[model samples]
Target: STLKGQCIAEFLGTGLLIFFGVGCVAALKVAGASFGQWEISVIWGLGVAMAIYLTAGVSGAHLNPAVTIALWLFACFDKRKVIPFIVSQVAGAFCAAALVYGLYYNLFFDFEQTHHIVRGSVESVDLAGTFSTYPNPHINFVQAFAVEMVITAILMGLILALTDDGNGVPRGLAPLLIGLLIAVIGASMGPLTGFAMNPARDFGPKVFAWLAGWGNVAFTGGRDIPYFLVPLFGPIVGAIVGAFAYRKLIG
Candidate 1:
């Protein structure tokens, strides 16, 4: 099947995106006293954009599970392939994050000075986590969910409008457009949810953080998962709605 080889390409491309993209954030933590959230956003946006350019033809370059679910709902993808795509995306993300952790092991330890510094820094320090996400220790879940919905809806709409087959625009440019759109989203909404529009990107690095004991200092509580799930579900629904709305209005 044409998809067999294509799926592998998508997986590798997405893996690279999350690896270096998230890795940059982790690196920044070790190198600088302050975590640069904007840098992380830039990397994330550029990573997805580059992944799309590399594998769009091969497997539609759905590095985000939200995008894959949206495509499935719109019948753009075969039912049999959906599971494979999602699995690969998640697996690739995790592997990529792991690779980054391995690459930055020295940085992780070197940044910490004395035992007390590491211990104190670990407590409620925003810089401890890779790709700084804003923490609201006690936030209303509904508000968070609503915020996620709006952001994802905007992102999906942009994707649909720019990638319209009817326009016959240059194919390679989608990556640039995609990156800019994400950059806008992150710049605007990053302080709220860490602007993690892609579930795989957030989840991958998060899982790595928790497993490697990096979670202790970055996120004080274990409730960060909700922020991730909210955005993930929001993007999935938003993508579906965007595809349908585009067809109704433009097609």
Candidate 2:
């Protein structure tokens, strides 16, 4: 009914996702737990599904700003609610990051101190990356940008296809399908640029990381280039292109 309710739903949905998904990364990075990448991917996948299930009725589970923007561009969403939804999603992620940081405060310091890693330096990339994404050393800016864009493009295209009413997608199945898609993408392409398909998901924690002590390293990924912009902008452009492509070719 009211846009306020939807914004709150978005807030909780994204918050739950980060609490579970980023918490797993914290488990691995901060706690020094033993686990493979596959476990992390599935944890994230299930976290997304759970988030959707928890809040889909209220907000349609647009927990990511890229998804919200794409829906608006495709005329499938309310224009007045776009910025509110985006803001809520980022705030959700921001608060969730704080929660995770609280949960792992001791470990964050212990992990860094034990490894001789400073909080906001290039050398701390491995540790700081638990809060947000960084690049593969071998990749250049353009290549990393393209990777994020194309992956999110694939994400939006598949999301549109899976959720189309014409497809007769079974009831309540959309969340799992979307979750699985995210899982595969992260598992397959995460190494390239952390497969950050959602701007809020990356940006919120990034700003939190900055405030938490990572300084410019949070925004620059400890590099000269403002590499953070790659995840922030790439997914938006990709989702628009993908949405248009789907509307034109399929839906």
**TM-score against truth, every candidate:** 0.83, 0.97
Using TM-score as the measure, which candidate wins?
Answer: 2
Off by over 4 Å in 1: 33-39, 113-128, 131-139, 214-228, 249-251
In candidate 2, list every pair of residues with a backbone clash.
none
Local accuracy of candidate 1 as per-residue lDDT tens digits, 1-251: 37677678767877988876777677666755454657667777887888888888778888887777777777466888888887778778878877877887777666554333443244524544563244455565566666666777677767777877777666788788888888778777777766666667666666665666554543333453544556556667666777677667765
10 residues in a row with least lDDT, candidate 1? 115-124
Clash totals in order: 0, 0
The lDDT of each candidate is 0.68, 0.88
Residue-level lDDT of model 2, residues 24-124, one tens digit each, is: 99998878788676778778888999999989888888898999999998956888899999999999999999999999989889888888888778787
Evaluate residue 121 in candidate 1 and report its C-alpha lDDT on the 0 to 100 scale.
42
Q: Please list the Cα RMSD from the true structure of every candidate, rounded to 1 decimal place.
A: 3.3, 1.1
Query: Which residue runs does candidate 2 get wrong by more than 4 Å?
Result: none
